[PDB]
């Protein structure tokens, strides 16, 4: 009956990610119901990531002193109820939708920090990896389903409020079932040494760049492609297509990166950083062509999205392997936590807000007609290729010192005892 615990937690994860990307798929409508420009339509993701950030370490703490099942179920009930209750705000108040997003952040962070530990401490060496693998590869599926269901429900029911009321029913169901089918079961001196590790610092910066690009683009593309359709005198079959593409590029990129690094490990001992760098630079070339193909044709924009989207994810399976190769085995928990926080901070906590802000600054200094909506957004989203190229150069910088850092680690472990 452990198969049931695994399967129920996997469904919980799909729902977790489905309820992050249903505001994005109806973003165009929020603005027309509350009267806000772009800058105010970025706060809906900036505040979510700020709350998730700050709440994850604490729910990591309180998760092994006291019970667990209780904390999982409480988190699910909280975020499901706040989501459902937030589709009743009247038009006059905007800050209440933003507060909604903050509380949803707290609840989701709790669940996502605790479930892996439970599904870890129930299995063995030869199958733990398979269970964690199947649990994790529920990320692209949920992310795509977000856009899909938001668009479909809003299209059939004819009123966008209904987008925010269908997930929480499943939320309550899963939250009750995780109560009957689960069997319950010197960092200050670390940082002084982690901070002198050149490979570690450069790998952390080059993860920040990837999150910046992913967050900005994943909230701001569907709206941009709509504005493109309007200018070209051709017109919801936009978010449907974006969801469909992401649901498959997510797997394809990871398989690509694993395979290439496994062939390249037998020719030299700088395999992982060089694979990662070549992938990033290729993705930057193919991203910077959406904002050229979109003025004229749409199929070209979609092919460009496919290729750039695939090559950007190839380095998800690998940065863990770069961490476990230059850090001795007693300083690995501190390093994973510190890297995850920093990835969130210099990355997509303030990416969507920045794109919105730049777009509004451009628009305010020209006329206001649909053409200039389209151009303003196009000329604001041109930061993503720039920062992606920086990420590529940071992987090359780590591939410089990979060998010296592995050597120092080996001396340390044998020196301890």
């Amino acid at each position, epitope marked *: 009956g452990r198969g049931a615990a695994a399967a129920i937690l996997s469904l919980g994860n799909v729902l977790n990610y489905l309820d992050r990307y249903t505001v994005a798929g109806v973003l165009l409508d929020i603005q027309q119901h509350f009267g806000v420009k772009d800058r105010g339509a970025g706060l809906l993701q900036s505040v979510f990531i700020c709350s998730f950030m700050v709440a994850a370490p604490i729910f990591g703490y309180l998760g092994d002193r006291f019970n667990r099942k209780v904390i999982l179920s409480c988190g699910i009930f909280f975020w499901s109820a706040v989501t459902f209750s937030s589709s009743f705000i009247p038009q006059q108040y905007f800050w209440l939708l933003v507060l909604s997003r903050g509380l949803v952040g707290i609840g989701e962070a709790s669940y996502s920090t605790i479930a892996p530990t439970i599904i870890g401490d129930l299995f063995t060496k030869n199958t733990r990896t398979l269970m964690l693998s199947v649990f994790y590869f529920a990320i692209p599926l949920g992310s795509g389903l977000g856009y899909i269901t938001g668009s479909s429900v809003k299209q059939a029911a004819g009123d966008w409020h209904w987008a925010l009321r269908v997930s929480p029913v499943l939320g309550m169901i899963t939250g009750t079932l995780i109560l009957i089918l689960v069997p319950a079961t010197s960092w200050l001196r670390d940082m002084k040494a982690l901070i002198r590790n050149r490979s570690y610092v450069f790998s952390s910066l080059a993860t920040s760049a990837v999150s910046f690009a992913t967050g900005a683009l994943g909230m701001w593309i569907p709206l941009y492609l709509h504005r493109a359709q309007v200018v070209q005198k051709t017109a919801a079959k936009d978010s449907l297509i974006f969801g469909a593409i992401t649901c498959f590029t997510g797997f394809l990129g990871v398989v690509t990166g694993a395979g290439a690094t496994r062939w390249c490990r037998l020719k*030299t*001992q700088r395999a992982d950083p060089l694979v990662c760098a070549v992938g990033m630079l290729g993705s930057a070339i193919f991203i910077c062509l959406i904002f050229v193909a979109a003025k004229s044709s749409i199929v070209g924009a979609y092919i460009c999205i496919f290729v750039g989207e695939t090559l950007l994810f190839s380095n998800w399976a690998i940065t863990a392997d770069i961490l476990m190769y230059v850090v001795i085995p007693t300083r690995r928990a501190t390093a994973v936590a510190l890297q995850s926080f920093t990835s969130h901070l210099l990355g997509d906590a303030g990416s969507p807000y920045l794109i919105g802000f730049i777009s509004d600054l451009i628009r305010q200094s020209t006329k206001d007609s649909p053409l200039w909506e389209f151009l303003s957004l196009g000329y604001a989203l041109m930061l993503c290729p720039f920062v992606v190229v920086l990420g590529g150069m940071f992987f090359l910088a780590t591939a410089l010192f990979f060998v010296s850092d*592995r*050597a120092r680690a*080996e001396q340390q472990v*044998n020196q301890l*005892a």
Partner: nanobody
Amino acid sequence: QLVESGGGLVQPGGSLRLSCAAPGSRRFDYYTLGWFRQAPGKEREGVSCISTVGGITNYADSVKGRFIISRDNAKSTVYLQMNSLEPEDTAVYYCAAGREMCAPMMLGDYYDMDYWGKGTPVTVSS
């Protein structure tokens, strides 16, 4: 794979030299080596291991002082030199390559290595 050579029948007080090498242009320089062994009524246990950059070596508890390990990454080879053998060392010897660091309290763990060999038998009569 990795291909092993040496092995055979010696007498107590004898000596032997085993080698393990990679066929092709493969390199194994990201990591090459550790030597394991197995006997009929018992379980597989690590015998020794050698690191990647420095040239640091580690041995099990019963063979310390009698075995020696060496690595040659200029032509993809690893060597084990066995001196003053006994009747207790009759077994099958294997060669394996994995990613974890070279440390004491790492030898015994073998369910995590990437590539394995097939084995070469050593018999020490009386």
